């Protein structure tokens, strides 16, 4: 398999890396939650916006044209065009 248990997770020989951390009780919880959740969230949204906007814009433009045409067909002035279809 590609993932063992804790003793051997399949990681390559790892060496020269030092990891530091502090106790949760000694660390401030939710330090910059107020500032982070605004500024960093806006940064993430800015980075990922176009990928969700361009597809959304295309699909919603297609949906809007289809919906508007459908609304137009079922009206007194759309009767003839509905009949032709």
């Amino acid at each position: 398999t590609y993932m063992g248990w804790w003793g051997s997770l399949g990681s390559p020989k790892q060496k020269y890396i030092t990891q530091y951390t502090i106790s949760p009780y000694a660390a401030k919880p939710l330090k910059g939650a107020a500032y982070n959740a605004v500024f960093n969230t806006f940064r993430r949204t800015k980075n990922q916006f176009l990928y969700v906007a361009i597809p959304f814009v295309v699909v919603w433009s297609i949906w809007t044209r289809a919906r508007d045409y459908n609304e137009y067909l079922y009206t007194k002035e759309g009767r003839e065009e509905l009949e032709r279809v």
Binding site: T1, Y2, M3, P55, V59, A66, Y69, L73
Partner: protein, 383 residues
């Protein structure tokens, strides 16, 4: 060793919940799995409490549901839980498929898991649909009738399979009774499939939003991703309570509160929302047999996905074009779902045909072509 490892059952619980080496970089999306399990419990738990009052006879089904609603002490709560919880089960399952599609959770090491996933999906749909047929409202009865009539399109066995499905010559008492039996049962088969899903996950572990190997930096699950799962579970239950207690019928269709009458069809036939996309595909293809084949392909092609995705890099997080393709596919899927509930009309027939065309084209053209193009672009860029 600690009791949590020496004992066999506690050893299993430890392997899956306490010490499971999760990657440290997993988003909240990886919590959806847990939610689904929780939802699977709710559907079962509340479900078992509705069979204690639901009478499967055709002339008592709808009246029995109303007895639950009005007479049983908390019957209204249990029914709303069981219905909106199926809706949320499918919301979470669609999110869990969307995550597995965005990040390459379906790729080489986890194909089996992916396959089980698809099966679960398939199975769940049946369950949900069957459960709907139990209410025996107008929409219930006529959805059952339409499904059976379409399944009658099998080349030779179709004319003979449907009477077996009905237990008669039309959706009637035997059909509702057998739907109740199979609907009570198949959830436990689904629990078994979920256990198989969990074993296929445990063999190789879960992926990462970055896609790269997590073995370099993994964390236990008990201190981490259990209290993340608690956040996700309480958000789930908070929204679930917003729905169950306030506007519980938002997701349902009003016509389902009209007792089923075979002699008067309702103005429009639509499944519960979570099955609308496939229904749309079904109406996009004119031939009934072609429609059913395309409908089932719309799910089964997820199996083809792990092989058509020719990307050397797992996941979309670091891929530009693939992200545009994935979001376009997701929005087309939502468009198919929307078209599912709209009448067959001038623009919508063509729009549904195009939407189904691109829904399949995603898997069989866009994923391979885009993945190969991006592999080449990556290699050329670094050199």
């Amino acid at each position: 060793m600690p009791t949590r490892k020496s004992n066999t059952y506690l050893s299993l619980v430890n392997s899956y919940l306490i010490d499971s080496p999760q990657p440290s970089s997993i988003n909240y999306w990886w919590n959806l799995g847990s939610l689904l399990g929780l939802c699977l419990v709710i559907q079962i738990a509340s479900g078992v409490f509705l069979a204690m009052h639901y009478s499967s006879n055709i002339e008592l089904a709808f009246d029995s549901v109303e007895h639950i609603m009005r007479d049983v002490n908390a019957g209204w709560l249990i029914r709303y839980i069981h219905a909106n919880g199926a809706s949320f089960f499918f919301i979470c399952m669609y999110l869990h498929i969307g995550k597995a599609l965005y990040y390459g959770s379906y790729k080489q090491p986890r194909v089996m898991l992916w396959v089980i996933g698809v099966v679960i999906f398939i199975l769940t749909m049946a369950i949900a649909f069957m459960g709907y047929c139990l209410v025996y409202g107008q929409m219930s009865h006529w959805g059952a009738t339409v499904i059976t009539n379409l399944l009658s399109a099998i080349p030779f066995i179709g004319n003979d399979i449907v009477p077996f499905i009905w237990g008669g010559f039309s959706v009637s008492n035997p059909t509702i009774q057998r739907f109740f039996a199979l609907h009570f049962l198949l959830p436990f088969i689904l629990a078994a499939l979920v256990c198989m899903h969990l074993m296929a996950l445990h063999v190789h572990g879960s992926s990462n939003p970055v896609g790269i190997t997590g073995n370099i930096d993994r964390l236990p699950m008990h201190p981490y991703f259990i209290f993340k799962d608690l956040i996700t579970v309480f958000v789930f239950l908070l929204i679930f309570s917003l729905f169950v207690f306030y506007s519980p019928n938002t997701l349902g269709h009003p016509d389902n509160y009209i007792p089923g009458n075979p002699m008067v069809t309702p103005p429009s036939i639509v499944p519960e929302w979570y099955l609308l996309p496939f229904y749309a595909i079904l109406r996009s293809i004119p031939d009934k047999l072609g429609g059913v084949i395309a409908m089932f392909g719309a799910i089964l092609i997820l199996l083809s996905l792990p092989y058509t995705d020719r990307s050397i890099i797992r996941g979309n997080s670091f891929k530009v074009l693939s992200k545009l393709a994935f979001y376009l596919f997701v929005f087309n899927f939502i468009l198919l779902g929307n078209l599912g509930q709209l009448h067959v009309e001038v623009p919508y027939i063509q729009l549904g045909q195009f939407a189904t065309a691109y829904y399949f084209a995603h898997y069989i053209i866009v994923v391979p072509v885009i993945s190969t193009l991006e592999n080449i672009l990556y290699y050329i860029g670094t050199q």
